[PDB]
């Protein structure tokens, strides 16, 4: 068998999308190993029925608590950065040279698109190189445009994009002191594009096909999203059998899903707006508050009065969840794989974003794709909450932003589907391996 190496960036948003695509190829044969640090490790509870090998190689940053590797990154980017950089890289080709003393050898490294100097420790161990994007290609050209020079990280018009306000751009601002350093890594993606083997996009051409049209005329990209298959489609503990008996009890549309992913923090102020709106709209909800942000919730919020309508749980399988019929909408960060999922599972959105691309991802949503209204900030507060979610849940405009999340569920269904354009790039990406 071809044998495949795996190795996302540590974070969740990274992992899983690549994660997926492994399962896929995994299911046509390949042999995957996957390379994660000791700290995502920590976190991986269930690995089994994967029969993925999963190898560890060190944080190469410092061990803070239980903070993830994001967390103890942000506190200096720059610096811890470079130190994770040189880390991986030394111990990537370790490893490999460790993966070449069994049979099957490597072929191939597909590696997280930020990670691009990972290209040249894939070439010097002479396997191919795959940097995968886990943002769609809308975004991601917004980076390569950084990397040209085009637009800088300080209305805005680039090619085969739709008109944007400053509001709408990458939030890199956000990070304040590490403002710098986060615009330097994205477009740092675009490199050594030239040089890689294989360029591989979780969308499908459908989602935005000028700006993929426009990509490929520069590169052959593979649009092989979403990887996500629209059990062995999680690593960490997802809390299923709680989740979906809750769900099991819910009516048809009647359930908002609430999850500001695997990084966003809300403050303890913004926490209590929330919780208030999804209390005084008389909805069920699912809401994640992951387990550290729990204590920013009101005082008996969890524990009571949450208890008529919602379910609060600090992680879900959220492919589950989004598939479930009682599920009526999704307020989310707006986080890629979040968006992308829920397009998939035709869930329209109320969109909250944080930061980084999650500012573009809700303008596409919103505007674009038309399948999510966006919260206005004054802190959001309940009141604009609930009117999001009377227009999502109730209005005539709701049930417009439902037809045409099924539309794009459809469209998903064709794309991973027999003769779609991303099932076809897939088996074109595998056939080119043998
Ligand atoms: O309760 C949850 C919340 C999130 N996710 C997954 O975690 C990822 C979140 O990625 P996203 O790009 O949406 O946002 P990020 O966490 O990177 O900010 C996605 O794979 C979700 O499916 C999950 O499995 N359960
Ligand atoms: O190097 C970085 C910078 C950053 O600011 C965030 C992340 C990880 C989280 C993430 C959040 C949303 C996404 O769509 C996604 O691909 C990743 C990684």
Same mark, same amino acid.
């Given at each position: 068998?071809?044998?495949?190496?795996?190795?996302?960036?540590?974070?969740?948003?990274?992992?899983?999308?690549?994660?997926?695509?492994?399962?896929?190829?995994?299911?046509?044969?390949?042999?995957?190993?996957?390379?994660?640090?000791?700290?995502?490790?920590?976190?991986?509870?269930?690995?089994?029925?994967?029969?993925?090998?999963?190898?560890?190689?060190?944080?190469?940053?410092?061990?803070?608590?239980?903070?993830?590797?994001?967390?103890?990154?942000?506190?200096?980017?720059?610096?811890?950065?470079?130190?994770?950089?040189?880390?991986?890289?030394?111990?990537?080709?370790?490893?490999?040279?460790?993966?070449?003393?069994?049979?099957?050898?490597?072929?191939?490294?597909?590696?997280?698109?930020?990670?691009?100097?990972?290209?040249?420790?894939?070439?010097?161990?002479?396997?191919?190189?795959?940097?995968?994007?886990?943002?769609?290609?809308?975004?991601?050209?917004?980076?390569?445009?950084?990397?040209?020079?085009?637009?800088?990280?300080?209305?805005?018009?680039?090619?085969?994009?739709?008109?944007?306000?400053?509001?709408?751009?990458?939030?890199?601002?956000?990070?304040?002191?590490?403002?710098?350093?986060?615009?330097?890594?994205?477009?740092?993606?675009?490199?050594? =594009? +030239?040089? !890689?083997? #294989? *360029?591989? $996009?979780?969308?499908?051409?459908? %989602?935005?096909? &000028?700006?993929?049209?426009?990509?490929?005329?520069?590169?052959?990209?593979?649009?092989?999203?979403?990887?996500?298959?629209?059990?062995?489609?999680?690593?960490?503990?997802?809390?299923?059998?709680?989740?979906?008996?809750?769900?099991?009890?819910?009516? =048809? +549309?009647? !359930?908002? #899903? *609430?999850? $500001?992913?695997?990084?966003?923090? %809300?403050?303890? &102020?913004?926490?209590?707006?929330?919780?208030?709106?999804?209390?005084?709209?008389?909805?069920?909800?699912?809401?994640?508050?992951?387990?550290?942000?729990?204590?920013?919730?009101?005082?008996?919020?969890?524990?009571?009065?949450?208890?008529?309508?919602?379910?609060?749980?600090?992680?879900?399988?959220?492919?589950?969840?989004?598939?479930?019929?009682?599920?009526?909408?999704?307020?989310?960060?707006?986080?890629?794989?979040?968006?992308?999922?829920?397009?998939?599972?035709?869930?329209?959105?109320?969109?909250?974003?944080?930061?980084?691309?999650?500012?573009?991802?809700?303008?596409?949503?919103?505007?674009?794709?038309?399948?999510?209204?966006?919260?206005?900030?004054?802190?959001?507060?309940?009141?604009?909450?609930?009117?999001?979610?009377?227009?999502?849940?109730?209005?005539?405009?709701?049930?417009?932003?439902?037809?045409?999340?099924?539309?794009?569920?459809?469209?998903?269904?064709?794309?991973?589907?027999?003769?779609?354009?991303?099932?076809?790039?897939?088996?074109?990406?595998?056939?080119?391996?043998?």
């Amino acid at each position: 068998p071809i044998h495949i190496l795996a190795f996302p960036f540590p974070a969740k948003g990274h992992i899983n999308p690549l994660l997926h695509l492994c399962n896929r190829l995994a299911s046509k044969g390949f042999k995957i190993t996957l390379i994660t640090t000791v700290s995502t490790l920590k976190s991986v509870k269930t690995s089994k029925a994967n029969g993925i090998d999963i190898e560890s190689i060190p944080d190469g940053i410092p061990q803070e608590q239980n903070h993830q590797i994001i967390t103890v990154m942000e506190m200096n980017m720059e610096l811890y950065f470079k130190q994770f950089k040189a880390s991986a890289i030394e111990n990537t080709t370790k490893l490999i040279q460790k993966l070449k003393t069994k049979n099957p050898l490597p072929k191939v490294l597909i590696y997280d698109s930020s990670m691009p100097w990972i290209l040249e420790v894939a070439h010097e161990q002479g396997l191919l190189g795959a940097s995968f994007f886990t943002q769609p290609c809308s975004v991601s050209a917004i980076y390569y445009h950084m990397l040209q020079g085009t637009i800088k990280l300080p209305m805005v018009s680039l090619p085969y994009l739709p008109l944007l306000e400053i509001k709408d751009l990458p939030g890199v601002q956000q990070f304040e002191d590490n403002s710098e350093a986060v615009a330097e890594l994205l477009a740092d993606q675009f490199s050594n =594009i +030239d040089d !890689v083997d #294989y *360029v591989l $996009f979780n969308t499908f051409d459908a %989602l935005e096909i &000028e700006v993929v049209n426009w990509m490929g005329s520069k590169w052959p990209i593979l649009t092989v999203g979403p990887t996500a298959p629209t059990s062995i489609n999680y690593l960490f503990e997802t809390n299923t059998e709680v989740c979906m008996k809750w769900l099991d009890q819910r009516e =048809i +549309d009647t !359930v908002i #899903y *609430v999850s $500001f992913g695997s990084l966003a923090s %809300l403050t303890e &102020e913004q926490m209590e707006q929330v919780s208030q709106a999804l209390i005084r709209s008389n909805c069920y909800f699912l809401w994640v508050v992951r387990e550290e942000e729990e204590n920013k919730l009101p005082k008996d919020f969890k524990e009571t009065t949450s208890k008529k309508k919602g379910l609060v749980i600090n992680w879900c399988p959220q492919l589950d969840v989004l598939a479930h019929k009682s599920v009526a909408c999704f307020m989310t960060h707006c986080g890629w794989n979040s968006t992308l999922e829920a397009l998939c599972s035709g869930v329209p959105m109320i969109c909250m974003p944080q930061w980084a691309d999650q500012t573009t991802n809700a303008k596409l949503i919103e505007h674009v794709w038309k399948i999510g209204v966006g919260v206005n900030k004054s802190i959001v507060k309940r009141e604009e909450i609930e009117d999001c979610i009377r227009q999502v849940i109730e209005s005539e405009r709701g049930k417009e932003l439902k037809r045409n999340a099924i539309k794009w569920k459809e469209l998903a269904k064709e794309a991973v589907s027999e003769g779609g354009s991303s099932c076809n790039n897939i088996q074109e990406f595998s056939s080119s391996l043998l």
